[PDB]
């Protein structure tokens, strides 16, 4: 089967704005360059959250002041976002490509709802 | 109004080489990974080569790998094919169509939602 | 790479008739499935992305389904302006392949 990537359906936001996910994936070949990008979605448009390149076989890093922190033990990443608002609230999407040595490989995520409500 | 138009299409000898161009309009290029496909007479469609939005990543079909080069300059709203070695076989309508990769809109909308007009490339003696 | 095959090469159908056509790929490739229309001597035009959504502006009478190998596309009342060839792509994986096309023709 084709690559695949899992999420939690539904993530609620700590009242101090951190959220927490997983964002795991079952891989084709032996990539050395995989890019994460994790999107949001809603009101029908999609803007990027954050997004990373990693590669060797170093854990996922974000890079500097990113909203963003990560690990990764093997093909997976616990994803941590801080700063969330009450409008941050939607549909964030894990997208996994790997991109080096070709063939690319495309994965998109089921997607996360998260939700944030301004305490 | 969004525009593409090809060009540098012509008659080529075998083994010799051209560039097309692919100039856009109306649109933030800068913004939307690109694609070349081609068409044989009377064939169907080819996927020849994809580039990032930011030039940061290319793919190519197998048919010409080692010959053609695909680049961009986001600066002059331009897409390129170099094509080195050409064969008979490589003798096409070439277009050029742009693809927002999950970009805008929805992050699942991948796909060549607006195409050139095609230049012609004839590869003959 | 993907092979891309689609069925039948050719259509024969009337103004009003149920149309579906068949896509197949060597391989899983999840949903990531466009649909493309063609007429002769001009450029293609997308229809369907991600297998089953509406390109903007395609009329209603457009849908597609599947995921992994197997992929359809409908025309539920085929219309004089749908006679044309259409070509199924895969972007799962590099390189993007085509299927062959189908194209749909008007019966007599």
């Known amino acids: 089967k084709a690559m695949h990537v899992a999420q939690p359906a539904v993530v609620l936001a700590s009242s101090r704005g951190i959220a927490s996910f997983v964002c795991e994936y079952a891989s084709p070949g032996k990539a050395t360059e995989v890019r994460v990008t994790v999107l949001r979605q809603a009101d029908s448009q999609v803007t990027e959250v954050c997004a990373a390149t990693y590669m060797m076989g170093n854990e996922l890093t974000f890079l500097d002041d990113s909203i963003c922190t990560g690990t990764s033990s093997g093909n997976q990443v616990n994803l941590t976002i801080q700063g969330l608002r009450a409008m941050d609230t939607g549909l964030y999407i894990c997208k996994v490509e790997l991109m080096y040595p070709p063939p690319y490989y495309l994965g998109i995520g089921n997607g996360t709802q998260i939700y944030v409500i301004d305490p | 109004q969004v525009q593409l138009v090809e060009s540098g299409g012509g008659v080529v000898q075998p083994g010799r080489s051209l560039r097309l161009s692919c100039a856009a309009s109306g649109f933030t290029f800068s913004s939307y990974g690109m694609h070349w496909v081609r068409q044989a007479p009377g064939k169907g469609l080819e996927w020849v080569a994809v580039?990032?939005?930011?030039?940061?990543?290319?793919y190519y079909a197998d048919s010409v790998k080692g010959r053609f080069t695909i680049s961009r300059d986001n600066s002059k709203n331009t897409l390129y094919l170099q094509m080195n070695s050409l064969r008979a076989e490589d003798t096409a309508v070439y277009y050029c169509a742009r693809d927002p990769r999950g970009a805008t809109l929805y992050y699942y909308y991948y796909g060549m939602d607006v195409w050139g007009q095609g230049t012609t490339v004839t590869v003959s003696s | 790479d993907i092979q891309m095959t689609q069925s039948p090469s050719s259509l024969s159908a009337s103004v009003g008739d149920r149309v579906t056509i068949t896509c197949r790929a060597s391989?899983?490739?999840?949903?990531?499935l466009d649909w493309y229309q063609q007429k002769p001597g001009k450029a293609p035009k997308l229809l369907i992305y991600?297998?089953?959504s509406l390109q903007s502006g395609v009329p209603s009478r457009f849908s597609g389904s599947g995921s992994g190998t197997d992929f359809t596309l409908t025309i539920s009342s085929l219309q004089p302006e749908d006679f044309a060839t259409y070509y199924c792509?895969?972007?799962?994986?590099?390189?993007?392949?085509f299927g062959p096309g189908t194209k749909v023709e008007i019966k007599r």
């Open positions: 991600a297998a089953s």
């Open positions: 580039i990032w939005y930011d030039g940061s990543n290319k």
């Open positions: 391989q899983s490739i999840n949903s990531y």
């Open positions: 792509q895969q972007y799962y994986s590099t390189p993007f392949t």
